[PDB]
Design a binder for this molecule. Structure first.
Ligand SMILES: CCN1/C(=C/C(C)=O)Sc2ccc(OC)cc21
Ligand SMILES: [Cl-]
Length: 119
């Protein structure tokens, strides 16, 4: 029922979420949690939204998931001040996640996804 691309995206998601042990990025940030958030952050993202996008087959490539992942981390560094736990978590998550989503790792996954096609 799921494509090789969807399955790879879900495996990468599990690796990225393990780097968020405090679960700060699990769910959408609301204006109840973060006053004025919606006026500061115009393109919100979180892991639960990414998971739903995978399930709905909204991602056409791993790079599109990588873009959403970077956006998620950047949003938290834009809204939160550097001293806060949320900013510090976002900086660490972004750095760790960019190594999980390295261009060379992505290329290798693309190859194996492509191999399942035109058989
Ligand atoms: C959901 C945790 N969290 C945020 C997460 C991200 C990704 O930004 S930002 C923030 C601000 C206040 C708060 O508890 C008053 C929590 C809080
Ligand atoms: Cl890279």
């Amino acid at each position: 029922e799921q494509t090789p691309l969807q399955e790879a995206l879900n495996q990468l998601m599990r690796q990225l979420q393990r780097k968020d042990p405090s679960a700060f990025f699990s769910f959408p940030v609301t204006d109840f949690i973060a006053p004025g958030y919606s006026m500061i952050i115009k393109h919100p993202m979180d892991f639960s939204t990414m998971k739903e996008k995978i399930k709905n087959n909204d991602y056409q490539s791993i790079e599109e998931l990588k873009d959403n992942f970077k956006l998620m981390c950047t949003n938290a560094m834009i809204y939160n001040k550097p001293e806060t736990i949320y900013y510090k978590a976002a900086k660490k998550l972004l750095h760790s996640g960019m190594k999980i989503l390295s261009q060379e790792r992505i290329q290798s996954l693309k190859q194996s996804i492509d191999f399942m096609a035109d058989l």
